Amino acid sequence: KIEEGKLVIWINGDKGYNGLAEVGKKFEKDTGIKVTVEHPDKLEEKFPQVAATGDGPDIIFWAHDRFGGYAQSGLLAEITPDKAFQDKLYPFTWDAVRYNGKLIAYPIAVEALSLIYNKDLLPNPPKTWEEIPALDKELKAKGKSALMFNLQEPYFTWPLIAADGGYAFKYENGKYDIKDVGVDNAGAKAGLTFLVDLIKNKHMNADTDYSIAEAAFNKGETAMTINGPWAWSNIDTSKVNYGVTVLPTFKGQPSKPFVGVLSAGINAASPNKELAKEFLENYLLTDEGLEAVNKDKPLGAVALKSYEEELAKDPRIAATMENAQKGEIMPNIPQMSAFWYAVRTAVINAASGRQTVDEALKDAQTNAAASEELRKRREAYFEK
Numbered sequence: 003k004i005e006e007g008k009l010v011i012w013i014n015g016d017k018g019y020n021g022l023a024e025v026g027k028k029f030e031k032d033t034g035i036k037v038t039v040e041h042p043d044k045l046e047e048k049f050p051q052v053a054a055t056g057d058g059p060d061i062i063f064w065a066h067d068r069f070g071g072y073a074q075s076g077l078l079a080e081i082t083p084d085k086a087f088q089d090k091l092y093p094f095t096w097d098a099v100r101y102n103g104k105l106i107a108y109p110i111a112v113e114a115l116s117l118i119y120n121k122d123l124l125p126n127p128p129k130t131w132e133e134i135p136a137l138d139k140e141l142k143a144k145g146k147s148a149l150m151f152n153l154q155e156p157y158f159t160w161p162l163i164a165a166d167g168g169y170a171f172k173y174e175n176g177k178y179d180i181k182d183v184g185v186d187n188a189g190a191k192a193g194l195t196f197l198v199d200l201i202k203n204k205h206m207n208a209d210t211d212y213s214i215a216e217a218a219f220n221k222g223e224t225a226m227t228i229n230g231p232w233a234w235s236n237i238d239t240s241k242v243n244y245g246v247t248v249l250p251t252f253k254g255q256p257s258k259p260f261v262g263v264l265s266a267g268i269n270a271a272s273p274n275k276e277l278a279k280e281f282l283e284n285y286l287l288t289d290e291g292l293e294a295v296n297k298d299k300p301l302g303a304v305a306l307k308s309y310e311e312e313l314a315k316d317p318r319i320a321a322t323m324e325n326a327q328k329g330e331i332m333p334n335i336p337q338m339s340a341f342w343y344a345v346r347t348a349v350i351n352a353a354s355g356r357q358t359v360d361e362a363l364k365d366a367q368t369n370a371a372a373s374e375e376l377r378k379r380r381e382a383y384f385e386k
């Protein structure tokens with residue numbers, strides 16, 4: 003799809019791709035270089051597949067956790083911003099896009115899940131997961147439910163699993179121990195057991211996905227949802243009176259969402275590396291550029307200091323950051339994709355009733371360290 007005369011960009015379908023296309027149009031007007039923005043299905047899995055052939059976009063947008071795996075496989079080009087450009091973005095966002103001492107992507111925004119609630123149905127949202135089932139029963143009288151969120155992606159269920167002690171890989175000294183996974187412990191089991199019990203008792207449905215949960219919240223059928231900043235735009239249109247707040251506690255402990263830094267990497271096999279840098283540094287990562295994307299779908303807490311200062315006054319962004327503080331920045335190590343696959347499988351299988359919580363997470367513990375063999379291709383063509 004890529005050619006020396008134009009830019010191809012991949013970004014997830016829940017992000018402000020229309021706003022990004024607007025920045026692309028501005029870039030075209032100035033340079034004659036046409037920018038194509040695509041939102042492929044499961045693009046985070048598609049990229050490492052197509053890039054091996056010599057295909058793939060010029061620029062890929064995803065949360066930072068996937069980028070280490072890409073970098074390890076030599077699929078990304080090393081980015082080279084000067085001293086002056088680095089100072090315009092928050093230092094911790096640069097750390098999220100650092101792999102083996104090298105910058106491997108441009109950071110765009112910090113993302114964290116929050117509790118989103120209907121203020122008319124629920125003037126005071128629950129501080130506690132434990133109190134949600136009773137609230138759900140209470141709301142049935144009015145023909146409503148308490149809570150609906152995406153049960154198909156482990157990103158959304160992870161904050162509850164992590165609350166009482168679930169973790170990805172053990173972080174000691176400065177490195178991650180890829181053998182010490184923490185999805186098998188009593189805390190992680192307690193969290194998933196609570197969720198499965200909600201499902202079994204019909205407080206939630208195992209089949210609920212992103213679109214179902216969104217439709218239900220935005221039409222005022224459910225009092226609460228769990229989602230990121232990107233979701234606020236469609237809620238704004240719905241005229242549901244909504245608030246954004248701290249996620250509920252579990253066993254007196256905060257929910258711990260995995261924090262993502264939306265990042266832009268340059269394909270190593272791109273003929274347009276220079277134009278890619280030019281677009282990202284001088285068009286996207288500006289007040290005007292981020293505004294265009296943000297006005298489409300909210301980015302969260304943007305990496306660009308000057309624009310973040312303008313946005314920080316938003317109470318919804320303050321809540322995002324409060325949840326972010328209580329969560330953990332995702333690791334970016336290559337094993338993260340195996341982790342996500344293992345947890346994804348564990349949640350779906352436990353939620354459907356195919357496996358017990360105990361058995362589901364036992365198998366997930368293995369796959370987060372053993373299913374590395376399927377991932378470790380070492381290039382289908384060419385060597386290490």
Ligand SMILES: OC[C@H]1O[C@H](O[C@H]2[C@H](O)[C@@H](O)[C@@H](O)O[C@@H]2CO)[C@H](O)[C@@H](O)[C@@H]1O
Pocket residue numbers: 014016046065066067068113155156157158262342
């Ligand atoms: O569900 C596992 C999945 O979680 C994260 O993906 C998030 C992404 O960070 C957000 O920007 C948003 O698009 O929702 C996604 C979940 O559907 C990880 O970044 C991703 O690697 C992982 O597979």
Ligand SMILES: [Zn+2]
Pocket residue numbers: 019023039040041
């Ligand atoms: Zn489009």
Ligand SMILES: [Zn+2]
Pocket residue numbers: 135136139
């Ligand atoms: Zn009950």
Ligand SMILES: [Zn+2]
Pocket residue numbers: 166189192253
């Ligand atoms: Zn406990």
Ligand SMILES: [Zn+2]
Pocket residue numbers: 280284
């Ligand atoms: Zn220039």
